[model samples]
Target: GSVVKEKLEKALIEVRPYVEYYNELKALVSKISSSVNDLEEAIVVLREEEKKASEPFKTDIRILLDFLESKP
Candidate 1:
């Protein structure tokens, strides 16, 4: 039982960093998601303003909008 406990403690110590990394990754993803949302909104506004422009210009905006929307 003591040997089992020792092994368990060792395993827990090894896994601790992975658990911490997962939380850090979760927070990073949240921050990136928020930033992407803000950028998407800004691109939408820009697309609207470019609506009256030429096809190529508007197409570029559309491409950006599509890319942003397609993001996970």
Candidate 2:
């Protein structure tokens, strides 16, 4: 997979929890866009959400690295 956006999108798609952010949760929606402002703001929002999520969730999320990724 590609870096940044594609990578993030891949992660989103791979993690099949169907988390509907933007409306319910504080989503880093800018990760889907190219706006620098949205990027900064969304990154901040994600950092905050990271602070709120449980350690187990965070650890398991990292374990998502178990999946095979595309190259080039």
User: Tens digit of lDDT per residue, candidate 2, span 1-72?
Assistant: 213455445555655463433232213433323433333443444555456766655433333323212223
**What value of lDDT does candidate 1 attain over all alpha carbons?**
0.42
Global CA lDDT of candidate 2, please?
Answer: 0.40
How far out, in Å, is residue 13 in model 2? 0.4
lDDT digits (tens) for residues 1-72 of candidate 1? 122233223333444443334343234334334444455444455456447645544444354344435555
TM-score of 1: 0.39
Clash count in backbone of candidate 2:
1
Q: Tell me the spans in candidate 2 whose CA falls farther than 4 Å from its real position.
A: 18-26, 29-48, 52-72
In model 2, the worst 10-residue window by lDDT is: 62-71
Give model 2's TM-score versus the native structure.
0.33
Candidate 1 lDDT trough over 10 residues, lowest sum: 1-10
Note the Cα lDDT for every prediction shown: 0.42, 0.40
